[PDB]
Design a protein around this ligand. Structure first.
Ligand SMILES: [Cl-]
Ligand SMILES: [Cl-]
Ligand SMILES: [Cl-]
Ligand SMILES: [Cl-]
Ligand SMILES: [Mg+2]
Ligand SMILES: [Mg+2]
Ligand SMILES: [Mg+2]
Ligand SMILES: [Mg+2]
Lengths: 176, 172, 172, 173
């Protein structure tokens, strides 16, 4: 896709939704009300490579849980917003602070609360399992599903657009 | 016709296991349970409620997990440990002064079938038992616990011309 | 022919992991397990029991989780931590006074094979090791943990003409 | 035949954990503790491999007692966790066992496995491996990690070494 590659070039900030994007969208509940969530190892590797390439990252979530706080910290995610349903307001405040334009922002989502952002940013993507209305209004859909490498693919699409994937791969393959 | 059946709906009822969940039962060594729901499903149920359709759950099982989940979503009527689902329904229909033709029901297995057979919009999830699928008016594309409920909700919103308005909150 | 092999069945025997579950083992840090079962399977086992076929589980692993699940389902005979499945079965058969031809067994791996090869209806689930699939009388279309046990129960009920009645309950 | 040929000389079979022995999911509870899932087909395959005289190892960049217990339950003789440089660890282990790269098989799913995968005699990826790894491995299993890929890999080695029949024989009497 000419359009996605081109949209990838200007990205300085990559924002992820949590449930449905970093997870497969399942909520595990125990009888006491505590939760379990699941993330994916390909995704963690993708996010680390993206950050190492100079792209900053953020998560904006309508829910709130220490599990997400821990995961974000482990991956080096620099900006974490939880318990925020108004995602565009949150983003606008982040961008005012970092002084970036919408065209410098990539966002990966799965559902309606992600849509006001997806519609505005430079690289607004849906995961394959995303609500179809969100799919139809995004710039691109990942092939992989959330919690199954969608976030990794998003990461690689950006690294590739910016000419940085090859360098990332050379760390692990001696021929390049 | 499915859209026609959807128009008249005033009450949408869900089974739990196999419909709000994927049918899996998780047990720890001491017998406590874990259960999985889906976020697409929650957004769908919240949008149906907002549209003015009331919702209920009827389950043969019983767990605090489901009470919490029902409350978090604003589900107005919850019946658990009830194997006789049509008797539960009849009672609720009395309280609400509704007939069968105004009830949608989303089910996955034999105990849901007496209801599915009788209501205005009786649907099975994709993973439902084949015999239930055969006797339902419709079958969702999505599987239970993987957005079959969100799909059921939108079907009803769409049928009632309320889906565009629910989307408009996010396109402004 | 499978329908023919189903007729004489008086005892139905299940492996646990990969048959009543998807083959996944969940472990927590402290070392304790979580196991997952499926609601279609439970409904299927209850109907088969109600038709007058008795049920058993033979497993090489051992956990209180499986004991509780067996009890909840009304599974009559439970053997865990058993390496030689054929030895265990021979003894149960002597005690119940049945021949191999009256036994159905559903398994997923090598330890199940000596039984599967000897009984009247020796079946593998879809996700079974291919060597076991190749030496079974039949293979369920569904995967373990995902309704393969249900499917196996319905094959017996159907072979014995009892499925139609089991369904009728839900058509009234 | 190429894979069959590489399998002949194997004396050590090494596995990544996440994405190879598991489907790659990481389960976290509120208090930080984890759950991990393994697969019973995989356990049988690994036990059969060991029984044939091929030793086994695990090299992971993560660290959890769950893996320690799983490896001990399966009889996996060598375990290294928290190890970012997988080759460095393999080299240390090979000198101890006095084995060479050509006698090693490795089953991986992501970039940190690729340098080992490129060095060894039988360097395989699972079906769900990052595609760049799949492209550079000697071979790819049909099965996905956590769903029998390890079993399929074990059986490849067993068969290559004329040992699968004997493994199956126990169950044909
Ligand atoms: Cl990770
Ligand atoms: Cl939700
Ligand atoms: Cl059940
Ligand atoms: Cl095992
Ligand atoms: Mg989401
Ligand atoms: Mg159900
Ligand atoms: Mg088994
Ligand atoms: Mg890995």
């Amino acid at each position: 896709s000419q359009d996605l590659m081109q949209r990838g070039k200007a990205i300085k900030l990559a924002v992820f939704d949590v449930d449905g994007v970093l997870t497969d969208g399942r909520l595990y509940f125990m009888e006491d009300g505590s939760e379990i969530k699941t993330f994916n190892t390909l995704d963690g590797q993708g996010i680390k490579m993206l950050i190492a390439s100079g792209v900053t990252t953020a998560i904006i979530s309508g829910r709130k849980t220490a599990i997400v706080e821990r995961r974000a910290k482990s991956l080096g995610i620099e900006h974490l917003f939880q318990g925020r349903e108004d995602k565009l307001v949150v983003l606008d405040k982040l961008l005012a602070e970092l002084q970036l334009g919408y065209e410098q922002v990539a966002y990966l989502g799965d559902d309606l609360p992600d849509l006001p952002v997806i519609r505005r940013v430079g690289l607004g993507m849906a995961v394959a399992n995303a609500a179809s209305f969100v799919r139809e209004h995004a710039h691109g859909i990942t092939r992989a599903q959330g919690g199954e490498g969608a976030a990794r693919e998003f990461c690689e699409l950006i690294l590739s657009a910016q000419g940085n994937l090859e360098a990332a791969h050379s760390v692990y393959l001696e021929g390049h």
